[PDB]
């Protein structure tokens, strides 16, 4: 089984506990033996910053502390996203898919999960819409 790096937990914790990051992206390491942190989005990074950097032909995971000015205040939703574009190789797909539960259970505190397999699914509308699911 692919191991989740504890650094994946530390960064998720900095976001969840300290609001230190807008989002965190994760990818497998070189040996595909552990998922490691890839991109630490700071508090002012936009959803666009997160999105534009997603590999079109490779998978990734992400926590996006999606923010709102909505009814019951200004809300924050810790959204875990599995990015698995249909154009990724089967090996990449298989790996990310096969290891999603571990990262999800390691990341105690997720609030919304979404799976995006294309441009429209990873769009800001798809995600923002589901963020207040």
The CATH number given to whatever domain includes residue 33 is: 3.40.20.10
Number of domains in the chain: 1
**Those residues with Cβ within 8 angstroms of residue 33's Cβ, 6 or more apart along the chain or in another chain:** 2, 3
**Distance between CA 79 and CA 72 in Å, rounded?**
18
User: Closest Cα partner for 115 from 95, 73, 86, 77?
Assistant: 86
**Domain hosting residue 59, numbered range:** 1-133
How many residues does this entry show for the chain?
Answer: 133
- The full DSSP string for 19-80 is ---SEEEEEE-TTSSEEEEEEEE-TT--HHHHHHTS-TTS-EEEEEEEE---SSSS-EEEEE
Data resolution in angstroms: 2.3
């Amino acid at each position: 089984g692919i191991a989740v790096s504890d650094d994946c937990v530390q960064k998720f914790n900095e976001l969840k506990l300290g609001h230190q990051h807008r989002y965190v992206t994760f990818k497998m390491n070189a040996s595909n033996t552990e998922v490691v942190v890839e991109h630490v989005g700071g508090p002012n990074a936009t959803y666009e910053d997160f999105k534009s950097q997603l590999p079109e032909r490779d998978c990734r995971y992400a926590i996006f502390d999606y923010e709102f000015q909505v009814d019951g205040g200004q809300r924050n939703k810790i959204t875990f996203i599995l990015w698995a574009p249909d154009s990724a190789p089967i090996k990449s797909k298989m790996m990310y898919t096969s290891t999603k539960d571990s990262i999800k259970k390691k990341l105690v505190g997720i609030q919304v999960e979404v799976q995006a397999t294309d441009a429209a699914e990873i769009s800001e509308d798809a995600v923002s819409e589901r963020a207040k699911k």
